[PDB]
Design an enzyme around this catalytic site. Structure first.
Site, mmCIF file in Angstrom:
data_model
loop_
_atom_site.group_PDB
_atom_site.id
_atom_site.type_symbol
_atom_site.label_atom_id
_atom_site.label_comp_id
_atom_site.label_asym_id
_atom_site.label_seq_id
_atom_site.Cartn_x
_atom_site.Cartn_y
_atom_site.Cartn_z
ATOM 1 N N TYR A 1 0.849 -1.193 0.000
ATOM 2 C CA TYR A 1 0.000 0.000 0.000
ATOM 3 C C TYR A 1 0.887 1.247 0.000
ATOM 4 C CZ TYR A 1 -3.282 3.579 1.740
ATOM 5 O OH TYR A 1 -4.022 4.732 1.888
ATOM 6 N N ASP B 1 -11.363 8.402 5.148
ATOM 7 C CA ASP B 1 -10.191 9.241 5.350
ATOM 8 C C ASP B 1 -10.511 10.724 5.169
ATOM 9 O OD1 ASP B 1 -7.894 10.746 5.190
ATOM 10 O OD2 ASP B 1 -6.733 9.196 4.150
ATOM 11 N N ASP C 1 -3.400 4.440 10.320
ATOM 12 C CA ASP C 1 -4.401 3.774 9.496
ATOM 13 C C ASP C 1 -4.800 2.425 10.066
ATOM 14 O OD1 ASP C 1 -4.339 5.846 7.713
ATOM 15 O OD2 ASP C 1 -3.836 4.591 5.973
#
EC number: 5.3.3.1
Lengths: 125, 125
Positions: B14, B38, B99
Site C-alpha cells: 500500500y 479518510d 491507518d
C-alpha cells in the site's frame, strides 16, 4: 465536542495510570457501559466490572508504559502508538501495540481496542 | 484467513504503491465492496469506483510515504503508523496519521480508516 486536547490528555492519564499501577485511575476514564477488546479479535469486556477485572489481571507484573509517537485524535476518536515493557522469566519484554479510543459526549472512553500480535512482542534476550 | 505476515505485506504494498503513484496497485488491494474513511469522521467512500476516485485525487501531488513503526497485525486486522509528506504553493507539509485495515476472507482489505487531526499536520516541515 471532544477536543484533541481532551482526548490526548485522556491518553496520557491512561498511560500514567498503567505506569502507576493505578487501577481506579484506569477505570475512571471509561464509561460505565464501555467496552474493552484487547487484543483485537478476542471477546470484548462490557461494563465497569469486567473492565476493572481486565486491568487488574493485566497489572500482575510491574508495567513500564510510554507513548512512542504523537497522539492521533479526530471526530471523537483517538489512536496512539506505545510500548508496554516488563520482566518475564528474567527477560525484559516489550509489547508495542496501537490502541484506539471512542469517546462519548460526556468525554469518557466508551470503547477501547488494542491491536497487537506476536510480531509485536519483543524481548531483550 | 489472514496471517499477520500477509496483512503486513499488504500494508507495505500500500505504502509502496502510494510512493510509486500506482493507482491500480492501490485499488487492487481493496475488495469490490470495501470502504475508505479518510479522515475518520468523514463520509466513508464505498466501492471500487468511489475508492479509485479517492486515491486518484490523492495522487495529484507526488507523495513521500513512510512507515515509522512496526506494523501491528492480528485477527484479520492491521494498524500502522506513518507519514505523508508533500508540497504545494511552495510549502512542505507532513501529515502523520494512523491507518486501520480490516481484511476479508480472501485476504483483501474491506475497510480502511485513517485517523489524523489538526495536531497531526505539521507545516513548514
Amino acid at each position: 465536542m471532544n477536543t484533541p486536547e481532551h482526548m490526548t490528555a485522556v491518553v496520557q492519564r491512561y498511560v500514567a495510570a498503567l505506569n502507576a499501577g493505578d487501577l481506579d485511575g484506569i477505570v475512571a476514564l471509561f464509561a460505565d457501559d464501555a467496552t474493552v477488546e484487547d487484543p483485537v479479535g478476542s471477546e470484548p469486556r462490557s461494563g465497569t466490572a469486567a473492565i476493572r477485572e481486565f486491568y487488574a489481571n493485566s497489572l500482575k507484573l510491574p508495567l513500564a508504559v510510554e507513548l512512542t509517537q504523537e497522539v492521533r485524535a479526530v471526530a471523537n476518536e483517538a489512536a496512539f502508538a506505545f510500548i508496554v515493557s516488563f520482566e518475564y522469566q528474567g527477560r525484559k519484554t516489550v509489547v508495542a501495540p496501537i490502541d484506539h479510543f471512542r469517546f462519548n459526549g460526556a468525554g469518557k472512553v466508551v470503547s477501547m481496542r488494542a491491536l497487537w500480535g506476536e510480531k509485536n512482542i519483543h524481548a531483550g534476550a
